[PDB]
């Protein structure tokens with residue numbers, strides 16, 4: 001589990017969105033595994049605006065933050081899970097790192113701020129849904 005709290009937005013994995021998220025919906029995209037809802041309180045996270053390929057992510061199944069090198073956001077075929085059939089996921093970045101299904105929502109960050117959240121994984125890989133292109137998260 002986990003979310004990004006920037007401005008009056010909450011960014012979560014679409015597959016982990018709650019009824020309150022759907023009832024306060026700002027934007028969602030199944031191909032990216034992302035959903036954004038509105039919040040009453042202002043958040044403290046800031047979004048990175050860059051093309052870094054090194055950063056650190058939080059792994060709840062180890063209670064640890066790990067440094068990683070990761071690929072650029074791309075269209076990748078992801079195997080089936082209980083939340084989606086096997087399909088192409090867009091804006092996804094891969095790295096070598098430990099992960100388990102409940103690690104989704106952990107933040108990946110670089111020197112500039114938050115880069116994205118854990119979305120996919122297995123066999124020593126972890127995949128992150130990028131948010132750096134969502135410029136509107138910084139205003140309104």
Ligand SMILES: C[C@@H](Cc1cocn1)NC(=O)c1nn(C)c2ccccc12
Pocket residue numbers: 015033078079080081082083084089099100101102103104118119120121122123126127
């Ligand atoms: C919960 C789904 C969401 C999903 C996105 O694309 C399709 N399904 N993801 C997973 O199944 C999953 N995520 N991580 C971090 C893993 C690590 C090891 C094994 C499985 C996974």
Ligand SMILES: [Zn+2]
Pocket residue numbers: 048049050051052110111112113
């Ligand atoms: Zn950066």
